[PDB]
Amino acid sequence: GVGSIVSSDVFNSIVGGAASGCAGNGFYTYDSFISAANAFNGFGTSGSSDVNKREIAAFFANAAHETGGFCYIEEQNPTSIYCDASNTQYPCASGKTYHGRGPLQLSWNYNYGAAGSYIQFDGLNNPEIVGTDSTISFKTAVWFWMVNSNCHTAITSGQGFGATIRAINSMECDGGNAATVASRVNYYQKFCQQLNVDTGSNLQC
């Protein structure tokens, strides 16, 4: 399992410790990550050692970007509750909010609903659990990576780190946001060095 690639010390060196204004590994804990990772067959384990290390680095690099370096659990100063009232499969619960939570900043009624179906929490009535239970929190991210997006297939099929950016937020690609692409890439290069793996090519999108 992923615990043969990521030791406690390497995890802490990727996520950081709790500090002023920064949740770090106070919320984003090592055994919550491992517990989550090992629940999704293939995550960090499908390919060669190098491919698996790149996958892990790519996951953490996007998560570090989305969370401000693992400082935040929830989207900061949201202006929206992220309720798409047109979605009748996953209707919004009055009084609940669907702004970003967890490593990959799960957002919208429809995504919380789908994630909760898969992971076994009530995403519509209890989206806030993604910000209070670290194992669920990490599971939402690994679900997004493995089930709800092309991230896993991209990084494990030769497409490069940039293709994981495209799978998470394609508006940043094609010139859309050079700065956010640079931030994601900078974390990926750091984490590949910490995991002792070549970054590969095609880092931008």
UniProtKB/Swiss-Prot annotation:
Active site positions, chain numbering: E66
GO biological process, one term: defense response to fungus
Catalysed reaction equations from the record: Random endo-hydrolysis of N-acetyl-beta-D-glucosaminide (1->4)-beta-linkages in chitin and chitodextrins
Locations listed in the record: Secreted
EC number: 3.2.1.14
Entry keyword set: Allergen, Antimicrobial, Carbohydrate metabolism, Chitin degradation, Chitin-binding, Disulfide bond, Fungicide, Glycosidase, Hydrolase, Plant defense, Polysaccharide degradation, Secreted, Signal
Tissues where this protein is expressed: Expressed in pollen (at protein level).
Keyword rRNA processing: no
Keyword Disulfide bond assigned: yes
Disulfide bonds: C22-C71, C83-C92, C173-C205
GO cellular component, one term: extracellular region
Protein function: Has endochitinase activity. Hydrolyzes chitin oligosaccharides, GlcNAc(n), with different degrees of polymerization (n=2-6), a soluble substrate glycol chitin, and an insoluble substrate beta-chitin nanofiber in vitro. GlcNAc(6) is hydrolyzed at the second glycosidic linkage from the reducing end in addition to the middle linkage. GlcNAc(4) is further hydrolyzed to GlcNAc(2). Has antifungal activity against hyphal growth of H.rufa.
Domains (record comment): Contains an N-terminal substrate-binding domain (CBM18) and a GH19 catalytic domain. The CBM18 domain is involved in binding of the insoluble substrate chitin nanofiber. The CBM18 domain is not required for catalytic activity, but possesses antifungal activity.
Recorded family membership: Belongs to the glycosyl hydrolase 19 family. Chitinase class IV subfamily.
Protein name, per record: Endochitinase 4
Span covered, complete protein: 77 to 281 of 281
